[PDB]
Design a protein around this ligand. Structure first.
Ligand SMILES: O=C(O)C(O)(c1ccccc1)c1ccccc1
Ligand SMILES: O=C(O)C(O)(c1ccccc1)c1ccccc1
Ligand SMILES: O=C(O)C(O)(c1ccccc1)c1ccccc1
Ligand SMILES: O=C(O)C(O)(c1ccccc1)c1ccccc1
Ligand SMILES: [Mg+2]
Ligand SMILES: [Mg+2]
Ligand SMILES: [Mg+2]
Ligand SMILES: [Mg+2]
Ligand SMILES: [Mg+2]
Lengths: 351, 357, 351, 357, 191
């Protein structure tokens, strides 16, 4: 009945509300169907260096998916098989996930139903934390105050300054400004070796933080386990898992007490739902990484849903239909994901 | 926004096309609870439960009728309903009859949700319909009847059959399996089911003899809850051990897979927790590298296996055929999903009246 | 020689001495024998939703057991085999256990001997704790004072309030009122995920509690192990094990340093005695859950007996032959379990 | 309320119907300590101990006589007495001779308790009497005598026999086992017992040859306390390894089962800790999925196996037949519990006088 | 059957139904040429059959000899011998290790007795073909008696005075052969 009829991609470098210590390289995806609906998703390329490559890959993948049914699960299986030799990971897997997210958006539109309801769940608000960067004491404290004013009950800051004392000064200044009934997540963004991570993390633990994220190299699951083994505070990781199979290797060894898959890297909706099944059985509270628009839907269907990360990479090109009430993400009452392009703005940012 | 507006159940004892022969004697009927889940969209979801023994039948019907109070007026959102039932039954024990009743609700809710969207369940789950190889399931039949049933199954187009073994002597098991082989030829599957009847060392001895014979798998060689025991049996075999029909929820499956209890899995759509449980089970089987087959509930399992990354076989054991229209068909031994919304279950209303308890 | 001749069940909703934050759904069981004695037991249905189902199941099981010898061990084997396909767990296993407890009561009567002596043990008093609920600071403190006055040396309170600070306020107020030479057990009743359980439990540990019970989902033995691994205070669990086989899976992985089987869920007397053998070898102090009347006998025969839970669900329909002296349960000098129906009261509560 | 009021012991060296042939020579008698536990109910509990070698006989009798002081005037409550003896001997070591003496008390106390209630022990333990398959136990007999004994056992109705092997050459072991097979035919069990005589690699080599032969199990291939060694031998075999006759208390059994030392178990009613220890052992064997047989003490083991969920075989090796009435009978090779209170042991008082030490 | 694997499948299936201590005779009913008979028979022999009967054309005694020469299992034949003189020709060249005359074709009682004397001298165990009523008598007088064929062609029209106990035919205590017509039944079937 419903077939894919075309794929269009647009590579953009878009401005960010708050610069990271100023633009995000994105691939915006339109998936045309025989039912007249168009699915939308986007990818984050992390670095402009990967941006044209990711767009080129998707365009070259158009011939593989055009005329195939709009069945994301069957499409995912087909792509997994076709890329089994090239390696169904990294940019290839990201591109497949962009297709998956646009296909589920389209399937939601075909049925005139928000994605969360198509998944069999009710919409519910999800607590969100406001994600900042390696901002220094002044700006980190400022941004936390602003977030608290807006109703967010937690913030994340990036740490990993040259000295542990600088990490601690940032956390202490945030804590003074927001008080004790407030979440402070800290992200080391893979910056430390295992011994340095144990030392810094035990000091931060005494400080009072909500979680310690990616203390060491992301692929080092055993290293994360050794760090977690020396901590009472939970270690958080998962944004870098490419597919539920990478997540499964990390969970199988007990690398961390929390998980936060990235909707793109984990494999889109199809991968997210598989990830959610694993986190449930392993008893891991599961949060999101980026992709706040689709992650609101996904978390509502996730048995161990924990936090949504608010980090609005695509706001300059996507209508703000996702809203926050008392720090909670509220899924819009729109079919599929609720992504609507800001078409006038896209033209400004094309690479 | 679509709400559940009613739950009706009917207990029936229905005739089986293949009477099930056991060590005790022959059972000619199956105890089922037929479920109708009414909605504010007007469509009605259909599912059913198998109660296994008439002893459990009225109790299971009573439990579902009492559980109606928990779900009527809730939104038709199976994942959310499941979470609520799991929490409400956390003290009583979200397992056994309670879990089976919750699964009957879940299966009817997904059938209703398919109907709300006028789409076959497989498509709602995001997959394409595909034919799925099916084996014909027989019983503890002895040589004469096993041969007769195997010839019939081959003539119908099936490419495998399953027989129940666990006779008093290993030579009896071997005799039945060898006889089936003569009837079906070499390029044909013979699954064997010990139905939990052996201790570990007897299972290792019998299974090694069966393995030399050429069987497709050895199913539930010992007590179902003894996952460590299945692991010890599997460790001595090249043929795969099959189990899973008795897992109550994905959490039981998870425990068995975590210790490597078997190289194959076959969840029961009811006991595993309905569609919602099956999808979670499918994600575990994929990660653990376990080919996944079905147990009973052929109507819904044809949909579910089409969405299962490691789909293996569909079990054809047609418990509800007297009371459900044969919209599921078989071509070349492969189950063919009907082009109907939801699961494609249409009651045979005139027939149901014959069998009510 | 002695045969079962009949089974009668009565479903009741009975009032509770202290309401849980007010009635208990019970199935009262009479097992008639050819020796003229009648065994008594009862089941707890947890929720009225399961009550009629459990009674119906038992009535339908009557034909399986009538004319069988009064041999609880052989009867248990028969029921295990007959329910091997349906699943010998949940309500079915509970119903089998109700039969088992009434059969051992009858066997005690046949021999005119209290159950504890039939089991080969001497009666001894067993320390009991008074079990309360999620009562708030005022009522929890009140109930603990009342329990201390009555001679109990420990109480259990249910915690898991929205904030950890509320858990702590309850425990601190109880502690002030009862002093330092007194047991305060805390029960989370499966309310927390593993990270939240580690955090709350380490805070409660610093407070001074006797044990932390069911911090997370009961079937999650691995999660309980991970929680226990971060604690000095013992984790307690077991009330939800259906059969000694579930207990064995939890003990085999070291899920908790304490165990408390429920006489019904564990499989009656037959299951309890098996459970007791496992707790002995694994070195686990073993307490009871509910069923105080039979648990007094059972604990006297348990090598690692720890505490009896006083939580009098059936008092409104059972004569108070079990007494407490200095907080210790005293087994009555009566044949079998010492259960005598309050027949006038039963009529008031029939469903 | 019923109190122990006396303990009498008698050391005897009794004639064996089957002299036991060993590598050294033939032993024609067994050293036993016969136990009478008097009570305030008037009934007297009977049990006995096997001392294994006459070297231990007087020491074991002396130990029991001295232990009398701990139990006379205590209530006849075997579980409570056991706890007290375990605590009192915690420093000396609650194992070996001390543990065996405590077990003799326990077995006599349960026999007395059966008598107090005028009920067979099996019924007191909550089970029905059922016949239990028995194998006839022979010794290191060589070809001529093993064949002769095997023919006699088959004529008596036994369906299995056990022979002792561990000759200097593997071909000798094989020769004896093959000869027995000719005498009994193919549908008959042959258990083999190495009686701790091999090192691990020799046991693996010999056992793989025996396995090809068709034996029922391979018993105690290496030193009894080397559980890891039994595990390593079992890991190389399809045939099950059997052990357990030398476990002193359930705690020793527990250590062996925890590492997977063997697929079968056979506690000795004395060494395992009497009835009280046997019941605990039975609960462990059930959970670990181990079929459980007996070692010696056929009179009490017929009761105990009837209460054992994984009951497997009863060992017929009639050490005390000269001094105990043959109230235990065999029909079709199955031990039949006599309808007598307690264990059904009645002393042959005229015979005992012949054999006193 | 058209394929050897089909023959083997049927024989193996029978074996599962009856167990190991039970005879399975196989009859090719003259259907094979000599080399096919040698190939099929060697496969059947590995299977465990009791005998291989009439593997090729009945009058080809030399052909039966050549087939028998390649087998350990015995070749059976003789149902088609017309008179002892035909039996004599086959035995003289060693056509088969077993014989089974048909009471009719061999020449009745008179022919059977002569056939029995030949089978004795040639050392051939001798069974019957059809005519179970008279063959029970005749085999009792046959020094090398082997098996009686139970194939009850005339049961609808002859009283069942021949009985079977433990699979053994029991001669009735009646004069002559013990054949008593079922006169009411015969009328149903007349041509
Ligand atoms: O967790 C994140 O959001 C992230 O790891 C990330 C990584 C990559 C891209 C966007 C966010 C992070 C955010 C801010 C500063 C450092 C790291
Ligand atoms: O696998 C099955 O279908 C089953 O285990 C079963 C169990 C319970 C109900 C229906 C089918 C089985 C099949 C054939 C013979 C015995 C058992
Ligand atoms: O441990 C208990 O007694 C129990 O877990 C329980 C559970 C279910 C029924 C009765 C008692 C508990 C008691 C009071 C409050 C919460 C939990
Ligand atoms: O298993 C036995 O009975 C025993 O180990 C034994 C050991 C010690 C005393 C009695 C029996 C055995 C039997 C036959 C040959 C050698 C050993
Ligand atoms: Mg991060
Ligand atoms: Mg099965
Ligand atoms: Mg509790
Ligand atoms: Mg031995
Ligand atoms: Mg012929």
């Amino acid at each position: 009945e419903v077939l894919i009829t075309g794929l269009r991609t647009r590579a953009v470098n878009v401005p960010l509300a708050y610069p990271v210590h100023g633009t995000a390289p994105l691939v915006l995806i339109d998936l045309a169907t025989s039912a007249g609906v168009v699915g939308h998703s986007y990818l984050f390329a992390y670095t402009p260096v990967a941006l044209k490559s990711l767009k080129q890959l998707l365009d070259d993948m158009a011939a593989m998916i055009v005329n195939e049914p709009l069945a994301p699960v069957s499409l995912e299986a087909m792509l997994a098989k076709r890329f089994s030799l090239a390696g169904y990971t990294g940019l290839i897997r990201m591109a497949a996930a962009g297709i998956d997210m646009a296909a589920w958006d389209a399937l939601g539109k075909v049925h005139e139903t928000p994605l969360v309801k198509l998944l069999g769940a009710n919409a519910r608000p999800v607590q969100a934390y406001d994600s900042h960067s390696l901002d220094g004491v002044k700006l980190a404290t400022e941004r936390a105050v602003t977030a608290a004013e807006l109703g967010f009950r937690a913030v994340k800051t990036c740490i990993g300054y040259p000295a542990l004392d600088q990490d601690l000064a940032v956390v202490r200044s945030i804590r003074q400004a927001v008080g004790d009934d407030f979440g402070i997540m800290v992200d080391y963004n893979q910056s430390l070796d295992v011994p340095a991570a144990i030392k810094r993390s035990q000091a931060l633990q005494q400080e009072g933080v909500t979680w310690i994220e990616e203390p060491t190299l992301q692929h080092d699951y055993e290293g994360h386990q050794r760090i977690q083994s020396k901590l009472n505070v939970p270690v958080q990781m998962g944004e870098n898992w490419l597919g539920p199979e990478e997540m499964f290797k990390a969970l199988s060894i007990g690398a961390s007490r929390l998980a936060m898959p990235d909707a793109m890297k984990i494999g889109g909706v199809t991968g997210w739902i598989r990830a959610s099944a694993l986190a449930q059985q392993f008893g891991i509270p599961m949060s999101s990484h980026l992709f706040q628009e689709i992650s609101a839907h996904l978390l509502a269907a996730t048995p161990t849903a924990h936090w949504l990360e608010r980090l609005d990479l695509a706001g300059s090109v996507i209508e703000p239909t996702l809203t926050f009430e008392g720090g909670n993400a509220v899924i819009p009452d729109l079919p599929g994901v609720g992504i609507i392009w800001r078409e006038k703005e896209i033209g400004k940012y094309l690479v």
